[model samples]
Structure formats: C-alpha cells, structure tokens
Target: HSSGLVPRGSHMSESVQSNSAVLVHFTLKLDDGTTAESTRNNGKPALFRLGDASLSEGLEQHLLGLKVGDKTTFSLEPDAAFGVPSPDLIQYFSRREFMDAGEPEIGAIMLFTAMDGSEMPGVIREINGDSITVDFNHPLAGQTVHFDIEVLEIDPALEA
Candidate 1:
C-alpha cells in the first residue's frame, strides 16, 4: 500500500496502522525556542506504536502522511496540544498532610497515589497556614508547542 498523505484537518484516517517499533527523531520546543524535549541531545530516537496513545492525537495526525525518510515541522496551540488547564484538577489539601509527610517545603512537587493506585503528580502552588494548594495540571499545560519530526523508517508489515 502506498503511504497515504495525511490531510490538514481535525482528524487523520483510521486506516493508517503504524509500527510499534518506529524510529522517530523529534525536537520539542516552546514558542520561545526553549527546548522541552529532544532526541538529538540524548542521541536516541523516540519509538512508539500508532494508536498506542503515546503521543497526543493532534501530534499523531501530523505523522499520518509521513513515509520513511520524511521530515516535517508543525506547531500546535495549548488547547490542541496538552489541552487547556482545568479548574477541576486544582485542589486544596490540608497543610497538616504536608507536615505529616516530614513538612514538605513550599514549591515542592509531590506524587500522591490515587485510589486506583496510579501516581498523581501535584505541585504545591501555594502554602497557607493550614491549607496547601496543589495543581494537577500537566507541567506543560497552556503552552504552545512546536514539534520537528523525522520519520526514519516504516515497516509495512505492521500495517493493520
């Protein structure tokens, strides 16, 4: 099958099946050009399967038309990228909990185990006398992101 080019739209084709062990080289940066993530610095290519939900849907769509040895650059707004910040994700915890946990200092990042046994990362946004504000929003939330992607190879057999 020919590599179908992804059209610029809200979604990509569902027929595209990507390899699980893809060799992708990418550089992620903020609008300011500050590097957030880069495979070049680590000298390792990023690998992941399509439909695995490893990358955001918006980013996955950007890779749709790519073939082996293809490279492309694109940018996405915060809402299209990590998504907008949700007020529901913000919570206030009792300062006593921090004190009980060895009195965590202000501006500390802590991971609390959720009821489902998944770790939830929260940052101490503010520390009052008896209350601590924790925000569960992703660290990169509300930031425009730029991505440079290079497709090294594609395995046709993996197409489903």
Candidate 2:
C-alpha cells in the first residue's frame, strides 16, 4: 500500500522552475539535421541561472517538466524559434555607399551602428555593380530549430 495521491502535471510536482538553477548541455540543429551550435563541441557544460534571461521562453516551456539526468530532443517551430524572415530586413544599397571602403564582396557580413549606439549586422546577399543587396535578417529565421538537450543537474530551489 505505497500508493498515495499524485499530482500529475501540477506546479507542486517538483521539477525545473524559476526557483531552480540547472546545468545542461545541448546541441542546436537545423531541420536538415545540420548541427549549428553545441556546447559539447566546446567541451563545457552550460549553466542556466534562475534570474538570467538567457534561455528562450519557448525553450523553457519544453524543459519545465524535465528532471535531473533527463536527456531528450525537441524541435521548435519557426514562430516559436527565431520567427519568420521579414521582408523589411532585406534591402539594396548603392555601390557608392562603400566607395570609401574596398569592394564589398558577396557573402560578407558587415557591422553597422545605429544612432542609438546599437550595433546591427548585415550580410551581403548579392553585388550587382552599383546595386548591393544586403540581408539583415537572422540566419535561422524562417526555419525550425531542433535541440538535443541533456540535463546534467538541477540545483535546489533558492530562498525567496
């Protein structure tokens, strides 16, 4: 008679939450199974701080119920991941824009600064004489993200 009332998916179930800090290793892959990023490649385990806004909220939802020593893989849709590519981010600039500098080659990424002191990165998509097309969208936009996650440890919740 060891059975007792159980709370299946309730908040009291003692799983990962804002109160807990976790260390995990993960591999990020595209839908084509190409590994884009991996902590394992760097030979380091990643730390998940309770107060850090590091992990995406979409990814956190998938990890909410994972306990220590849990290893699993999941995929996030485009909207939940980097989101769809925006047409506004793609634009064409005149070649005179870079006359002071050397020729802008295709597939080159350039960093630009905004008046607000923020930095923006844009990649060259095409170079047609005086017309240069640059894409400022994220590389992962409009694509699904696949994550292979392994939870190494789950620290006890902190005091409020």
Candidate 3:
C-alpha cells in the first residue's frame, strides 16, 4: 500500500514540496477585516496543489512548513502578494471606440471576450474630451492581504 506521503523521488525540493496538493479551509480578509473570501462560507474547503502558482507566491510560501491539521494566519505585502500596479499598464483609448460601440458612459466597467472565450475586465479610469483611459490591472493590486488557513487534509495522489 502506498504510504501516501510525497515521494522522495520527486524533483520538487522541500520548500516547493510544502506547496503540494492539500485540502485547505481558509478565510481571506482585507485590511479592514471584512471577509473577502471564505471556504467555510461555502461549507467546503478548497483543495489545490501548492507550488503550482495556483496561489500567490507569498501565500504559498507562508503555507510551507505546515503539515496536515496545521492552522496559521499570515499577511503578505503588496509587492510579494499580488504586486503593485504598473502605470504603463494603464492605457488611454479614443472615445470614438466607445461612441461607435454605443458604450459612451464613463466609469463603466467593461468586459471584453477574448478569442479564447476568456473574459477580460477593464475599468473606465477617466474621460477626456475625446479620449478614455482604462485600467486593466487587478483592482486589488498594491494592497496587502491577509489569510487565515486551516490545513484539513494532505493527499499526495492529488498532486500532478
């Protein structure tokens, strides 16, 4: 019978191995303590592999060293977390595009469907005489985030 522990033959190092697949119950709160996301709220914890970049680097790093049944609280800075916003990512577009498309409202959030059917959300940043600036960066960028995580189960077979 397989012991189910992470195989020593795996190429991932100890630090990276800590991020392997685990069922985790977590509550995410903003700086204000308002619950932004919670697995308990849905009555089921989230199960995901670590080191997969599925979770942010900061979050995964914090999860390292934790074994099954471990519960911990951690905070991540903007840079180490979702990262700071880039001014270059903010772009200005011609108002004609909005006008021609019948989307002339300023400050309206818009979703553009990509060729792959993925939806990209952009916020209307500003409206000039004939130009509109839209910010495509994540709204949570440049913000610190907090996580309260409870490790529920660790499953090696779930790893990919």
Q: Quick one: best TM-score, which candidate?
A: 1
Cα lDDT for residue 91, candidate 1: 94
* lDDT tens per residue, model 2, 1-160: 4789565664343467775577789999997889888997979988765546566677777778788778888899887777799999998889998877567889998876669999888899999989999999987888899998888877744589
Each prediction's RMSD over C-alphas, in Å, is 6.7, 5.8, 5.9
Q: Model 3: per-residue lDDT, tens digit, 6-30?
A: 6665343333255477778898788
Worst 10 residues of 2 by lDDT: 5-14
Model 1, C-alpha of 32: deviation from truth (Å): 1.6
The 10-residue segment of model 3 with minimum total lDDT is 10-19
lDDT of 1 at 39: 96
lDDT score, candidate 2, position 47: 74
Q: Candidate 1 or 2, higher lDDT?
A: 2
Clash pairs of candidate 1? 6-65
Clashing pairs in 3: 19-50
